[PDB]
Write an enzyme that holds these catalytic residues in place. Structure first.
Site, short mmCIF file in Angstrom:
data_model
loop_
_atom_site.label_atom_id
_atom_site.label_comp_id
_atom_site.label_asym_id
_atom_site.label_seq_id
_atom_site.Cartn_x
_atom_site.Cartn_y
_atom_site.Cartn_z
N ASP B 140 4.25 1.63 3.94
CA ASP B 140 3.10 1.35 3.05
C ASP B 140 3.70 0.71 1.79
OD1 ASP B 140 0.78 1.43 1.57
OD2 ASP B 140 0.10 3.35 2.30
N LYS B 169 1.35 -1.25 7.01
CA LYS B 169 0.22 -1.53 6.09
C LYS B 169 0.76 -2.62 5.16
CE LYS B 169 -2.04 2.08 4.55
NZ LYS B 169 -2.48 3.22 3.68
N1 LIG Z 1 -1.72 9.93 6.82
C1 LIG Z 1 -1.21 8.81 6.11
N2 LIG Z 1 0.05 8.93 5.51
C2 LIG Z 1 0.47 7.76 4.77
C3 LIG Z 1 1.65 7.54 4.07
C4 LIG Z 1 2.79 8.61 3.79
N3 LIG Z 1 3.69 8.18 2.91
C5 LIG Z 1 4.97 7.74 3.77
C6 LIG Z 1 5.30 6.29 3.60
O1 LIG Z 1 4.89 5.86 2.37
P1 LIG Z 1 5.50 4.59 1.51
O2 LIG Z 1 5.93 3.42 2.42
O3 LIG Z 1 4.42 4.25 0.61
O4 LIG Z 1 6.73 5.09 0.73
C7 LIG Z 1 4.61 7.93 5.06
O5 LIG Z 1 5.75 8.38 5.92
C8 LIG Z 1 3.53 8.99 5.09
O6 LIG Z 1 4.01 10.28 4.92
C9 LIG Z 1 1.57 6.23 3.56
N4 LIG Z 1 0.41 5.70 3.98
C10 LIG Z 1 -0.28 6.62 4.73
C11 LIG Z 1 -1.63 6.50 5.41
O7 LIG Z 1 -2.36 5.56 5.39
N5 LIG Z 1 -2.02 7.65 6.07
#
Ligand SMILES: Nc1nc2c([C@@H]3N[C@H](COP(=O)(O)O)[C@@H](O)[C@H]3O)c[nH]c2c(=O)[nH]1
Ligand SMILES: Nc1nc2c([C@@H]3N[C@H](COP(=O)(O)O)[C@@H](O)[C@H]3O)c[nH]c2c(=O)[nH]1
Lengths: 217, 223
Positions: B140, B169
């Site tokens: 994300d 995402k």
């Molecule tokens: N259930 C659900 N978790 C996350 C996450 C959480 N944050 C982690 C990754 O985030 P990032 O890339 O932002 O650092 C993921 O492993 C998960 O735990 C981000 N987006 C989502 C989403 O849309 N849904």
């Protein structure tokens, strides 16, 4: 559907794939999945009507629900594939639940490798998901530890496999998906130095194959 | 063929099951499984030709094999369902591999962002000069994977370090992070189902959905 046979070299073949490390086939994927789904229905039927400590409304007792789910502790690493399949069947039957993990190992004396991270299990229904009961020593250790440290309302065990003839201490899981022969099993989570866990079927291991991978990972 | 409908309460129904917490369906089980299996074929095709440090015979370099398998590090707790499915597809395509787990957690705190801690270390101790693949649930912002990659590289000195995510995402990125393998792309919404959770709830769903706005705070009590 599956085809189980031996090739010209006497090696077990399942669906065109040779398994030269296998002595006998125990269960095909179809048999395993049907057995897990049948036990999922039993687990959902047993827990669905029960109530336990209400930590959502800081209240007294409340029904098992998404607010107060059944607590499942999965035993790593052998149970992770079984757990992934079982939780999806438990969801099919509508059983509210959450999963945390613990890991133990032997040095044979038992020691915790990884602790659970759930901290509010007092007065909760707790179900342990484990790969196999053999001597029973591993599960006796886990049950005694979870009971004394978490003080759950009830503590039960579901195993993918029961090896009945291996028992050395009293330990009969409340739920058993499959019964296996008194032999070393591989496949569907069962390993030889982390090899063979990805197989969709369970087999017994040829005895000479147990030390094929002696190097630590 | 899955049956997707809405009931009189406006709630999404998939194969007779209601999802009152869901805003929209992202992917059915059939679509998710087809996407994972396709990426498993890509991973097997990419790694089976490669060689890395021989720890079985104590020679120099040797092909990926059951003697010297690909090392997979799965990120707990979020990736365990994805990992269980992926490893069985990798076995179907004949990729020799073994799996270890790293556990990371995010905590609500007094600072501007939720804070990460490593809760469980890998148990594998011979990854020097090995091909290592990380299996993760979603990229994300990219911050979680940047933290994991740096840690694994500094502690294990792998020959190569790649990442396979179930979900990308793309519109959430805050730092550079492009996984090498991506099973599916998700909308710029909070996703739930097939491993994706709200305080450990919804992971067992066979399909992926977007969460109704504000429902990420539905279960405030610590487990
Ligand atoms: N259930 C659900 N978790 C996350 C996450 C959480 N944050 C982690 C990754 O985030 P990032 O890339 O932002 O650092 C993921 O492993 C998960 O735990 C981000 N987006 C989502 C989403 O849309 N849904
Ligand atoms: N692969 C494979 N592991 C075990 C085990 C492992 N040992 C533990 C259970 O043993 P016990 O009940 O004797 O304490 C578990 O960690 C289990 O994974 C027992 N029997 C077998 C078997 O037949 N095959």
């Amino acid at each position: 559907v599956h085809v189980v046979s031996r090739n010209a070299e006497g090696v077990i073949v399942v669906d065109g794939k040779a398994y030269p490390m296998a002595e006998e086939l125990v269960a095909t994927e179809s048999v395993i999945q049907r057995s897990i789904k049948a036990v999922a229905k039993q687990i959902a039927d047993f827990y669905r009507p029960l109530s336990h400590r209400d930590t959502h409304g800081g209240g007294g007792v409340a029904p098992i629900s998404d607010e107060n789910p059944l607590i499942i502790i999965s035993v790593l690493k052998g149970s992770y594939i079984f757990t992934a399949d079982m939780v999806r069947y438990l969801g099919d039957y509508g059983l509210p639940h959450v999963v945390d993990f613990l890991r133990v190992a032997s040095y044979n004396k038992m020691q915790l490798l990884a602790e659970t991270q759930f901290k509010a299990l007092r007065g909760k229904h707790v179900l342990i998901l484990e790969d196999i009961v053999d001597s029973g020593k591993t599960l006796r250790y886990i049950l005694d530890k979870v009971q004394r440290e978490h003080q759950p309302a009830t503590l039960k065990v579901c195993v993918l496999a029961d090896k009945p003839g291996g028992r050395r201490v009293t330990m009969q899981p409340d739920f058993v998906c499959l019964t296996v022969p008194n032999k070393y099993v591989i496949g569907y989570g069962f390993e030889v130095n982390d090899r063979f866990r990805c197989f969709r079927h369970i087999f017994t291991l040829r005895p000479g194959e147990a030390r094929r991978y002696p190097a630590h990972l």
